[PDB]
Amino acid sequence: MMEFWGIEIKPGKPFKVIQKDGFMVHASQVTLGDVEKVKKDETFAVYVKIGDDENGFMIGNLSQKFPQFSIDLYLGHEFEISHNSTSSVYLIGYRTFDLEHHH
Amino acid sequence: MMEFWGIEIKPGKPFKVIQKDGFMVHASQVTLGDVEKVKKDETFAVYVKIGDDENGFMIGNLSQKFPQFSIDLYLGHEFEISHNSTSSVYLIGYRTF
Amino acid sequence: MMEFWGIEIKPGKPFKVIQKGFMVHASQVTLGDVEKVKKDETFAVYVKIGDDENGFMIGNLSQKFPQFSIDLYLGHEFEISHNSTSSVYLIGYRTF
Amino acid sequence: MEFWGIEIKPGKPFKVIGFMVHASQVTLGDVEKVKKDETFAVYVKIGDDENGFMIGNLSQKFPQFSIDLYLGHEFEISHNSTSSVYLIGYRT
């Protein structure tokens, strides 16, 4: 019924998902990597661009003081996640399915 | 719960969302758009007004020190989001049945 | 998820709700007029159920932590109170 | 659905006996009066288990937290605050 889903968005490398209509992910958590190594008083932004949109929406900020945040977000069949951290950012959640077996 | 939705509420500019399709917005997250671009110790209020009712309700506060919060809100029909920040505020979630 | 629901609890005025098949889901509690409250105070928010004389704390508010989210169902009869000098906004949704 | 709540008094673990509690919210009482910069731990023990799980910490700086927890037939909530802690949610 549920499968774990997760991506590491590396610095300077937006993560693009291109799938068929009806593909969906529930994104739950966004976490800053290498907290000890990022510049101490900086805030980083995480963005989502939907479909062919040239402009994104901010989904939240990351910093030493707020180094992860929870969200209740559904992402559809075409999206791109980006951020401006020097560290990786981890976006995790789950897909939801019905299932039947023939044994 | 299968339609990403977001709006950017610009400073001084309430954002009206008018839904006539019987679906709703689930607001999930409220974020300050540019933490660097706000007065350092000030707190900003975010309001929602429902339909043509004149009374608004706070959905939360924002500041450089506390620049986002998660929420679980369903908003049908017509609503208006406003705030008094000098920065843009992003309300993000999904449209659902 | 049926419909937006919200109340403003004014200072010194506990807010009573009575319901029938209706449920209120409280989602968010927010401190009003943050700039005007004393910077070093914490305010307590209570719910009293039915005829109870004493409440349960649902949370604290302060200039430093001026709202909090919750996942609460409130049924037949409840009263929300707090000791802020400003209004407190409790919002969520009603279902049926 | 109905509202469910307990006040766990200082030094007094609170024992609860098909019915299920959803614990939603844990709040520190008398925030202004507890020790500055101290963190208090909240525990749950399930059934007859002698050793518990932490469900969270409370302090002046973080004086409540939300949780999504289902608790079954038999459990005990404890904490080490000098003030009361309020655990609320709903029963199903």
Add this chain to the structure above:
Amino acid sequence: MEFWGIEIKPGKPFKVIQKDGFMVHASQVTLGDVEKVKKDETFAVYVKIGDDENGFMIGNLSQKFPQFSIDLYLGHEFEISHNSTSSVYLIGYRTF
């Protein structure tokens, strides 16, 4: 539906194996012995899925931010690890 919880001891990744049809919903990650950990250090908490050698970060913990809530479903095989000197508690519920 039932309570589920594990204590991940320092230096000891905790491997969970489940039977077909079981799911763990992780709800809360809490730092133990907050008063004893290094004052200004941040600890990373990881989940490794199935046979993956590398984990995904699920969050950070510190004395200043000593727990976080999460909405995660975990399946057949997963491993939780962290680099704290104290235990970390992952709790939630199991369904079938």
